[PDB]
Amino acid sequence: HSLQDPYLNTLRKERVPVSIYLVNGIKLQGQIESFDQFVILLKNTVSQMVYKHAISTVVPSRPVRL
Amino acid sequence: HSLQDPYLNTLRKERVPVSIYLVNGIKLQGQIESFDQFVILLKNTVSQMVYKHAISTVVPSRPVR
Amino acid sequence: SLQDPYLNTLRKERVPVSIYLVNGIKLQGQIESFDQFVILLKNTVSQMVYKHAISTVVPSRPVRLP
Amino acid sequence: KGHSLQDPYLNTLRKERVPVSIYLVNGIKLQGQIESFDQFVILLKNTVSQMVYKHAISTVVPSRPVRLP
Amino acid sequence: HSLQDPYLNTLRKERVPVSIYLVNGIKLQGQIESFDQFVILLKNTVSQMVYKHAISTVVPSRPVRL
Amino acid sequence: SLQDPYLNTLRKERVPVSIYLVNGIKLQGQIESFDQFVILLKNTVSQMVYKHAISTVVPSRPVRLP
Q: Counting beta carbons within 10 angstroms of the beta carbon of residue D57, is it exposed (0 to 12), middle (13 to 18) or buried (19 or more)?
């Protein structure tokens, strides 16, 4: 958890565009507005709450330094 | 946790129409009637119980908070 | 808990229900009993369904809500 | 109601050696009889004796009606 | 793990070749090198790490006794 | 556990790997870091992978097992 939090928090603070792929193959895009232990609030063309358990990978639009 | 609860509770109180997408791709629509640690009660024709573990995303029909 | 009182109402009232699995399959019958991890579904034949494999429980008619 | 239902149910199928079908979340249908089980897996006997993870199981359907204790 | 540990440990010790079916339908084959609470190390050309949560069934190539 | 030392070796030794997701997709790269729930993979694209979405981790060459 010592890696996930800083990573998501940095993406959030720096408003880094991200692509979030779900386990079912669907791709969501936007910026991370906030998150907690179980969900990620993604804002963009469509604001939405995403459950982490349904996420396979988070691919930042550019590398992030922690 | 700190975000999911306030978020769901807001959608509930404001009776905001939502779209709930399941991990299998199916889309449910209705209003959040109530929820607990493991389920969400989605109201429509009849209120159905959705297990959170089966949910991918919750998309509000309008801006909240 | 909201799940327990809800399932108990469906059980007590013997309400016909549809149980959708996470893989899209639809089961029909009535809730005979349940515990923390499974539900006993009675229909043409009885069967034990793991809750981790359930997506939604849809009653055939409105029922008292917890 | 932790395992108040699951344990007595699986144990009945086990002791009575009831033929059963176990459907997995991916759609596969396994057949045989429950040899034993613990909190996470089920040992299913058929052509061979295999270990099934409960997390991959959707439903357990007895070949015939069963009476719980 | 009253059954899981003894079972996997026997397969490991007897070096019994096994078929591991994943929840996505892919079939892996090899010998169990080791395992812990979350993963199993499956040896073949190279030893790959398999997450238990992705496993549906473990099928021994030949009968084993517990 | 086995997972940690195993992943740490692949990391410390910059071993190229293939991570197969529970949905079949194959990711390739080198493990940059990881914690209890995610693995940061890097190669052509950098990305955070949730362990719950991973089925197997396959090294490009044999490595010292834990």
A: buried
| Angstrom distance (rounded) from CA C20 to CA C58 | 8
Residue E24: give its domain's CATH number: 2.30.30.100
Domain that holds residue C19: 1-66
| Resolution value in angstroms | 1.9
> Into how many domains does chain C fold?
1
Three-state secondary structure string covering E13-56: HCCCCEEEEECCCCEEEEEEEEECCCEEEEECCCCEEEEHHHEE
Q: Nearest Cβ partner of F24 from E24, E28, E48?
A: E24
Q: What string of DSSP letters covers chain A? A: -TTHHHHHHHHHHTT--EEEEETTS-EEEEEEEEE-SSEEEEESSS-EEEEGGGEEEEEESS----
Method by which this entry was solved: X-ray
Query: Looking at beta carbons, which residues of chain B come within 8 Å of C3?
Result: 36, 38-39, 49
